Write a protein that binds this DNA or RNA. Structure first.
Ligand code: MG
Ligand code: MG
Ligand code: MG
Ligand code: MG
Ligand code: MG
Ligand code: MG
Ligand code: MG
Ligand code: MG
Ligand code: MG
Ligand code: MG
Ligand code: MG
Ligand code: MG
Ligand code: MG
Ligand code: MG
Ligand code: MG
Ligand code: MG
Ligand code: MG
Ligand code: MG
Ligand code: MG
Ligand code: MG
Ligand code: MG
Ligand code: MG
Ligand code: MG
Ligand code: MG
Ligand code: MG
Ligand code: MG
Ligand code: MG
Ligand code: MG
Ligand code: MG
Ligand code: MG
Ligand code: MG
Ligand code: MG
Ligand code: MG
Ligand code: MG
Ligand code: MG
Ligand code: MG
Ligand code: MG
Ligand code: MG
Ligand code: MG
Ligand code: MG
Ligand code: MG
Ligand code: MG
Ligand code: MG
Ligand code: MG
Ligand code: MG
Ligand code: MG
Ligand code: MG
Ligand code: MG
Ligand code: MG
Ligand code: MG
Ligand code: MG
Ligand code: MG
Ligand code: MG
Ligand code: MG
Ligand code: MG
Ligand code: MG
Ligand code: MG
Ligand code: MG
Ligand code: MG
Ligand code: MG
Ligand code: MG
Ligand code: MG
Ligand code: MG
Ligand code: MG
Ligand code: MG
Ligand code: MG
Ligand code: MG
Ligand code: MG
Ligand code: MG
Ligand code: MG
Ligand code: MG
Ligand code: MG
Ligand code: MG
Ligand code: MG
Ligand code: MG
Ligand code: MG
Ligand code: MG
Ligand code: MG
Ligand code: MG
Ligand code: MG
Ligand code: MG
Ligand code: MG
Ligand code: MG
Ligand code: MG
Ligand code: MG
Ligand code: MG
Ligand code: MG
Ligand code: MG
Ligand code: MG
Ligand code: MG
Ligand code: MG
Ligand code: MG
Ligand code: MG
Lengths: 51, 193, 148, 203, 99
RNA sequence: UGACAUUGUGAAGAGACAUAGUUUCU
RNA sequence: CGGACCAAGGAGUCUAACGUCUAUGCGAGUGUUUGGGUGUAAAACCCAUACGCGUAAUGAAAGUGAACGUAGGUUGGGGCC
RNA sequence: UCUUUGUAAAGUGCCUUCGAAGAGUCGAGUUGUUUGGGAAUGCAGCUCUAAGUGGGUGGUAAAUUCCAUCUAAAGCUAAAU
RNA sequence: UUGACCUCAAAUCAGGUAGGAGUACCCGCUGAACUUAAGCAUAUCAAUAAGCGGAGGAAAAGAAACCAACCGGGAUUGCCUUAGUAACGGCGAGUGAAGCGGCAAAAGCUCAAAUUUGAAAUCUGGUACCUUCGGUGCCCGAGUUGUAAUUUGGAGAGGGCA
């Protein structure tokens, strides 16, 4: 009966994922994260819906 | 073991309490088994709709009679008033309650109007065989929601016949406060030989 | 977590933060709320005056709810009208047509009078008013209506 | 029907006719063994309202259990322990003498199953009972839908778990604020309110 | 009844348009019936009066329905039953060794 | 050690409605 | 006082309910996670009704319930003009 | 798909009469235990022991007058646990 | 003299059942003290441990002699909450539920008491046949000191009428 899970305010959760969504633009940080992407068209890379 | 400026806490841990801790690790598990077991009902339930029809009911106590709430079953009256017997209306997904009583017409008329609309929006397959496959609507409480009765208008004229409402309260409180005495004075005054 | 836990800082110092003299023994003061009236009376008068002994009536089987009666002041009141419909009524502050706030529908039991609502007429369905509550409503053209 | 008469004449226990009877009968029991097979209901109105029926597979039994209190065994009244627990003599026992009667015959014919039991008489030594039972293997029972619930395995020695009428009494199972403490079942409702439900997303 | 329409005072309550619903027979449980009337009476001349009652009526004839009740209230359980018990011996006496 | 319950049947004697016998005790 | 010597174990934890403080979210409100929805399935994602704390106090209680006034006057006040 | 089980069985409207409902139990005194239950929450022992427009409950003992609210002292029964 | 009836016995009489085990969970009986109170007896630990009886796949509870006091609600059970509250308490230590509200799951009922009285309409067993978790004929037997149908308070029953 140790704690194991953790409550995050529902909103703080969104604020987070939102910020995480916006970082997936900024080229610098995707390259910072690993991610071999100096050879990609643009960012956000958007691809046909036929995918 | 009294120290510092600290609210006096009340932590009841002087039984073998480690012996009766319930950590719901199976929460997610149980949702799963619940969902799963609904889905099996819903299938074993043929084109029927999981739930029975509930009545409208004004909830009890001075705290909740503002609200109106789905009750248990439909009173021998409303059933008969909406024209089908008890013993049958329970085979048609309609819940009866032989205990509940009909004192308030507005809710009565309601629940018959509830009975009407339910019968109208459902079809009862015959005892023959056919079984004209007809896709379950799963609730019925969703089909036939329960609305709070509108009690007035957004705006209206300002009828101020003058009597302070505030005062009307104290005056009625008081009438109740000395009602018992004022009647003892009426008995001892009537006893005047 | 345990790595900013001070006891990690304390590793290697004989006493663990607990004095060589006075140690960390079992229960010096007694356990719990022991000696409330005795060796711990300084802490309970101040920090906790009023603690000991009785006051008032008992009330066997007291169902809270009997006494249910949320309180909203004139102070707000107008807030029980959605903002869009709201200005529609402020402007055009008339009899004939004045808003009908059902506060028990909105979940209150008493209207109190914290202070100043504009000169707009309002119709107040409430269960109980305060004197001023009802007084201030009139002086703007409103009335209270008594309800259950 | 002759049954209603019997029901009411029985409610006149101080009436002369009844105590001539009850004094002649109550000797006739104290001669036979503490447990003995009855032959018929001596209170057929009572039996037949308590569940009884006159057809192969129903049984009645007369059983006799001494009256008074439970003397706490305890050698030489010696308690070893605190004053509150130092009593020996004014302790009563939480089950009724009905129960104890039921339980001893139910053990006397384990192949029967105790349906119910009723009080019949008493002196100052003993209280007397007739205990109505049902052989759940007799096919006249096993058909007959009404009774055959008794045949199940969950109705084994129903009388040593207090699910006869007298055991639901002493168990305190009744609805309402009078019975809060003992009602869903005492230790169960106890143990409930002494559990520490911790959620995952701790509330 | 009829509630006033306000939240305190005598007939405090929300005015609703009412209905008075079909009476219940789980409400006529005590009600006599000619079969019980008959049977209990035939019992009574069959079985008679009972010690504590045979003391109760002679008490009545020689002390009345005050020391009667006071005696009956302890003998039975309660004042109330003691009332309706005296009453039953009063009416033994009347229709009997009188008219 | 006392009361009650287990506990019933006679006979004489006291005792009350206040010197018919339902009742109570030696 | 303990300690012949070596290795390896070896002691401020976890939990319930709390005080000050700090960080974060939102703000007169706030808390999705009992539950339902849903899923690439103990995760993430979503959500209606309540509830809890807060937005009123004070009396043992019946009860009453916060603008004389630019929400006051005075004296220091950063900052601004 | 084979037997029609039927001169079977059940449901519904009005008139009239009726409407049976659990006893050494409910209840009371007391003793002991227990409970948050406080002039006594449940339980048992012993004495007392009911009624039928009755009975039980209505969280302060009692008398009176009312009101509410169920229907005890026999019984069965899936799920969520 | 012969046949019952009641009650009670005997069989290596015909068929059946109970025991023991287990026991996490479940219905009960019974029942501590260590402990806490900075002492200690009431209290507490705890209606806990040990001891005894009894079940199932769950058990138990269950269609109100309930909650309430409302515009009332409507079997049980479990969760969120009510609430560390009302109340208990050398009113010290400490203890401590419920009604409402949301949710999970839902489902409801049958005897007793009634003259079938123009028909004991009912049932165990044995037995022969069969389409064998059973049916039918016949016979012992049960049963009127009451086996069926009907009725269960929500009702409902006997007449009459459509
Ligand atoms: Mg200090
Ligand atoms: Mg706890
Ligand atoms: Mg401890
Ligand atoms: Mg588990
Ligand atoms: Mg699960
Ligand atoms: Mg459902
Ligand atoms: Mg209503
Ligand atoms: Mg309510
Ligand atoms: Mg078909
Ligand atoms: Mg760490
Ligand atoms: Mg570090
Ligand atoms: Mg820590
Ligand atoms: Mg340091
Ligand atoms: Mg260091
Ligand atoms: Mg330190
Ligand atoms: Mg030091
Ligand atoms: Mg040291
Ligand atoms: Mg020193
Ligand atoms: Mg001190
Ligand atoms: Mg205190
Ligand atoms: Mg008091
Ligand atoms: Mg009070
Ligand atoms: Mg107040
Ligand atoms: Mg305010
Ligand atoms: Mg005021
Ligand atoms: Mg009697
Ligand atoms: Mg026999
Ligand atoms: Mg000892
Ligand atoms: Mg001991
Ligand atoms: Mg004897
Ligand atoms: Mg408790
Ligand atoms: Mg228990
Ligand atoms: Mg239990
Ligand atoms: Mg959780
Ligand atoms: Mg936390
Ligand atoms: Mg003597
Ligand atoms: Mg004799
Ligand atoms: Mg030393
Ligand atoms: Mg040394
Ligand atoms: Mg090491
Ligand atoms: Mg160590
Ligand atoms: Mg800090
Ligand atoms: Mg912040
Ligand atoms: Mg707010
Ligand atoms: Mg989640
Ligand atoms: Mg899973
Ligand atoms: Mg989604
Ligand atoms: Mg919803
Ligand atoms: Mg809120
Ligand atoms: Mg506060
Ligand atoms: Mg104040
Ligand atoms: Mg004062
Ligand atoms: Mg006043
Ligand atoms: Mg002034
Ligand atoms: Mg003034
Ligand atoms: Mg000045
Ligand atoms: Mg009954
Ligand atoms: Mg006594
Ligand atoms: Mg005990
Ligand atoms: Mg009291
Ligand atoms: Mg008691
Ligand atoms: Mg009273
Ligand atoms: Mg009543
Ligand atoms: Mg039965
Ligand atoms: Mg059961
Ligand atoms: Mg044999
Ligand atoms: Mg065994
Ligand atoms: Mg066991
Ligand atoms: Mg104990
Ligand atoms: Mg210990
Ligand atoms: Mg100690
Ligand atoms: Mg110590
Ligand atoms: Mg000691
Ligand atoms: Mg003690
Ligand atoms: Mg105790
Ligand atoms: Mg324990
Ligand atoms: Mg044990
Ligand atoms: Mg098994
Ligand atoms: Mg089963
Ligand atoms: Mg299950
Ligand atoms: Mg019922
Ligand atoms: Mg009601
Ligand atoms: Mg309920
Ligand atoms: Mg408290
Ligand atoms: Mg303590
Ligand atoms: Mg304690
Ligand atoms: Mg305290
Ligand atoms: Mg306790
Ligand atoms: Mg507790
Ligand atoms: Mg609800
Ligand atoms: Mg059923
Ligand atoms: Mg019929
Ligand atoms: Mg029948």
């Amino acid at each position: 009966w140790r704690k194991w899970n953790v409550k995050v305010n529902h909103n703080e959760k969104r604020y987070a994922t939102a910020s995480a969504i916006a970082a997936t633009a900024v080229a610098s940080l995707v390259l910072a994260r690993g991610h071999r992407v100096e050879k990609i068209p643009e960012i956000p890379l958007v691809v046909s819906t036929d995918l | 073991a009294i120290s510092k400026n600290l609210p006096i806490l009340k932590n009841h841990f002087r039984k073998h309490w480690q012996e009766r801790v319930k950590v719901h690790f199976d929460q997610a598990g149980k949702k799963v088994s619940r969902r799963n077991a609904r889905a099996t009902r819903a299938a074993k339930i043929a084109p029927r709709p999981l739930d029975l029809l509930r009545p409208v009911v004004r909830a009890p106590t001075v705290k909740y009679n503002r609200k109106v709430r789905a009750g248990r079953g439909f009173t021998l009256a409303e059933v008969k008033a909406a024209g089908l017997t008890a013993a049958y209306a329970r085979t048609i997904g309609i819940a009866v309650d032989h205990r509940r009583q009909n004192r308030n017409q507005e809710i009565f008329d309601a629940n018959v109007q509830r009975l009407k609309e339910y019968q109208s929006k459902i079809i009862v397959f015959p005892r023959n065989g056919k079984a004209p496959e007809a896709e379950q609507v799963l609730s019925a409480a969703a089909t036939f929601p329960i609305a709070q009765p509108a009690t007035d208008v957004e705006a209206r004229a300002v009828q101020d016949n003058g009597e302070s409402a505030f005062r009307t309260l104290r005056l009625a409180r008081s009438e109740k406060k000395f009602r018992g005495i004022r009647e003892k004075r009426a008995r001892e005054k009537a006893e005047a030989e | 977590p345990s790595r900013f836990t001070k006891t990690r800082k304390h590793r290697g110092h004989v006493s663990a933060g607990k004095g060589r003299i006075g140690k960390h023994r079992k229960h010096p003061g007694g356990r719990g709320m022991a000696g409330g009236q005795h060796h711990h009376r300084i802490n309970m008068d101040k920090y906790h005056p009023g603690y000991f002994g009785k006051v008032g009536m008992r009330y066997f089987h007291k169902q809270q709810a009997h006494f249910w009666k949320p309180v909203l002041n004139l102070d707000k009141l107008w807030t029980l009208i959605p903002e869009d419909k709201r200005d529609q009524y402020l402007k055009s502050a008339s009899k004939e047509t004045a808003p009908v706030i059902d506060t028990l529908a909105a979940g209150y039991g008493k209207i109190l009078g914290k202070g100043r609502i504009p000169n707009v007429p309002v119709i107040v369905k409430a269960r109980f008013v305060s004197k001023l509550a009802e007084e201030k409503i009139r002086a703007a053209g409103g009335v209270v209506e008594l309800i259950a | 029907g002759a049954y209603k008469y019997l029901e009411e004449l029985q409610r006149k226990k101080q009436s002369d006719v009844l105590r001539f009877l009850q004094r002649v009968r109550v000797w006739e029991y104290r001669q036979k063994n503490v447990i003995h097979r009855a032959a018929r209901p001596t209170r057929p109105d009572k039996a037949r309202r308590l569940g009884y029926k006159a057809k192969q597979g129903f049984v009645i039994y007369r059983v006799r259990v001494r009256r008074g209190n439970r003397k706490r065994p305890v050698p030489k009244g010696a308690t070893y322990g605190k004053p509150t627990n130092q009593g020996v003599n004014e302790l009563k026992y939480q089950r009724s003498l009905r129960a104890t009667a039921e339980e001893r015959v139910g053990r006397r014919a384990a192949n029967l199953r105790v349906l119910n039991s009723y009080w019949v008489n008493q002196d100052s030594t003993y209280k007397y009972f007739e205990v109505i039972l049902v052989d759940p293997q007799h096919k006249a029972i096993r058909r007959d839908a009404r009774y055959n619930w008794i045949c199940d395995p969950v109705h084994k020695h129903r009388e040593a778990r207090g699910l006869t009428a007298t055991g639901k009494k002493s168990r305190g199972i009744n609805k309402g604020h009078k019975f809060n403490n003992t009602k869903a079942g005492r230790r169960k409702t106890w143990k409930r309110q002494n559990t520490l439900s911790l959620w995952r997303y701790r509330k | 009844t009829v509630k006033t329409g306000i939240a305190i005072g005598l007939n405090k309550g929300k005015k609703v348009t009412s209905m008075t619903p079909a009476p219940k027979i789980s409400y006529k449980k005590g009600a006599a019936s000619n079969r019980t009337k008959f049977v209990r009476s035939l019992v009574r001349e069959i079985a008679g009066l009972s010690p504590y009652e045979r003391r109760l009526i002679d008490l009545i004839r020689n002390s009345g329905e005050k020391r009667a009740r006071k005696v009956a209230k302890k003998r039975l359980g309660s004042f109330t039953r003691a009332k309706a018990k005296v009453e039953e011996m009063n009416n033994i006496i009347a229709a009997s060794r009188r008219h």
